[PDB]
Swiss-Prot record, chains A, B:
CDD domains xref list: ketosteroid_isomerase
The keyword Lipid metabolism appears for this protein: yes
Class of the enzyme per the UniProt entry, highest EC level: isomerase
InterPro entries to which the protein is assigned, alphabetical: Ketosteroid_isomerase (IPR039256), NTF2-like_dom_sf (IPR032710), SnoaL-like (IPR037401)
Gene for this chain: ksi
Effect of substituting residue 121 to A: Slightly reduces activity and reduces protein stability
Effect seen on changing residue 99 to E: Slightly reduces activity. Reduces activity 10000-fold
Complex and partners: Homodimer.
GO molecular function: steroid Delta-isomerase activity
Source organism of the structure: Pseudomonas putida
Induction data: By steroids.
Protein name listed in UniProt: Steroid Delta-isomerase
EC annotation from Swiss-Prot or TrEMBL: 5.3.3.1
Outcome (variant: residue 31 to S): Reduces activity 4-fold
């Protein structure tokens, strides 16, 4: 069903867990079949599981961790702060991001927006 | 002008500074005259400076602090994680919140959404 506030916290925490281990298939399955992703927020969105799988396969040796609690609403939405550690061309770097997600009545991510830019990168 | 990513970080950091000291008039002036606020996200929005001033005067002895860096995009938007400390009826409590803001071409907050619920309260 439409995830409650407590359920949204668990779903979003799980999402970061999946990104951390790099299980591309488990990540893609968390999204609705026609979900849209705007990463970073400001650029045109990618639509559907095929494009999303390509996005995550391309983006993912990356370690991600929640840097604060998941903020959840009562209308199936949530927002969370986290850090992504990568090694950009031999040189290691970190990226601070905030993801905003809206879930559907099946508990899947319907839309996702990622807030970050070069100001949040540390290389 | 439409704030750059670096400018959005400064504006949002300033906003928390104002909430922390409790300068209601300086806070209200940061919003556009017809801005909308959804706090908490999920409830109907308040529109305009009059209603917003009433909201902040009612809500504000409160101390707020950024708990992580401001995430900013290139389209005049940003998101930030912070904690609000209040003393609910003699008993002290904290609230973890994430604010998402969109600025206009004048550098004022056009819309603001606050993500939090009872799951983010510690009393």
């Amino acid at each position: 069903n439409l995830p409650t506030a407590q359920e949204v916290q668990g779903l979003m925490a799980r999402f970061i867990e999946l990104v951390d281990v790099g299980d591309i298939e488990a990540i893609v399955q968390m999204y609705a079949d026609d979900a849209t992703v705007e990463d970073p927020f400001g650029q045109p969105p990618i639509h559907g599981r095929e494009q999303i799988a390509a996005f995550y396969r391309q983006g993912l040796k990356v370690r991600a961790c929640l840097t604060g609690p998941v903020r959840a609403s009562h209308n199936g939405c949530g927002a969370m702060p986290f850090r992504v550690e990568m090694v950009w061309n031999g040189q290691p770097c970190a990226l601070d991001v905030i993801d905003v997600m809206r879930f559907d009545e099946h508990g899947r991510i319907q839309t996702m927006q990622a807030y970050w830019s070069e100001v949040n990168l540390s290389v």
